[PDB]
Amino acid sequence: GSSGSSGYGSEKKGYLLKKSDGIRKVWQRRKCSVKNGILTISHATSNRQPAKLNLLTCQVKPNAEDKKSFDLISHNRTYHFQAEDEQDYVAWISVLTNSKEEALTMAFSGPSSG
Numbered sequence: 001g002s003s004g005s006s007g008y009g010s011e012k013k014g015y016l017l018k019k020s021d022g023i024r025k026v027w028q029r030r031k032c033s034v035k036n037g038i039l040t041i042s043h044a045t046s047n048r049q050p051a052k053l054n055l056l057t058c059q060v061k062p063n064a065e066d067k068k069s070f071d072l073i074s075h076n077r078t079y080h081f082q083a084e085d086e087q088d089y090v091a092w093i094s095v096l097t098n099s100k101e102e103a104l105t106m107a108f109s110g111p112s113s114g
Contacts, residue, residue, distance in 0.1 A: 002090075002093075002094055008091055008094040010095065010099035010102045011034060011095070012033075012034050012095040013032075014031075014032060014088065015029055015030065015084065016029075016030060016081055017029055017030070017081065017082040017083070017084070018041070018079065018081055019080035019081075028044070029084075030044060034095055034099055036099075037055045037102070037103035038054060038055065039052065039053040039072070039096070041053070053072065053074060055096060055099055056100060056103055056107070057075055058072050058075075059073035060100070061073060062093045067086060067089065068084075068086055068088075069081075069082055069083070069089070070083070070089070070092065072096075
């Protein structure tokens with residue numbers, strides 16, 4: 001992961017790329033947002049309602065070599081995201097992951113009757 005001091009923050013607002021529905025594998029730019037450990041995705045084809053994604057349950061799989069790339073694994077679902085620049089990616093990954101942990105560490109690990 002990110003060695004040294006990594007204090008980016010569990011909050012970031014900008015834009016990212018996401019693979020089309022499925023039929024096509026084209027990367028489209030969309031306004032992304034991360035807050036309270038949640039990732040929202042605005043629509044472009046239908047201005048009805050955005051799409052929130054819980055990072056607590058999702059799994060951020062940052063590319064191994066192909067920099068500026070990360071896959072978001074959701075409940076029985078897999079998404080495809082891509083950063084715009086190297087600086088944007090580095091941060092994004094740091095956040096997405098951070099927001100998740102920073103939220104888990106403060107959350108309960110296991111249930112215990114009273």
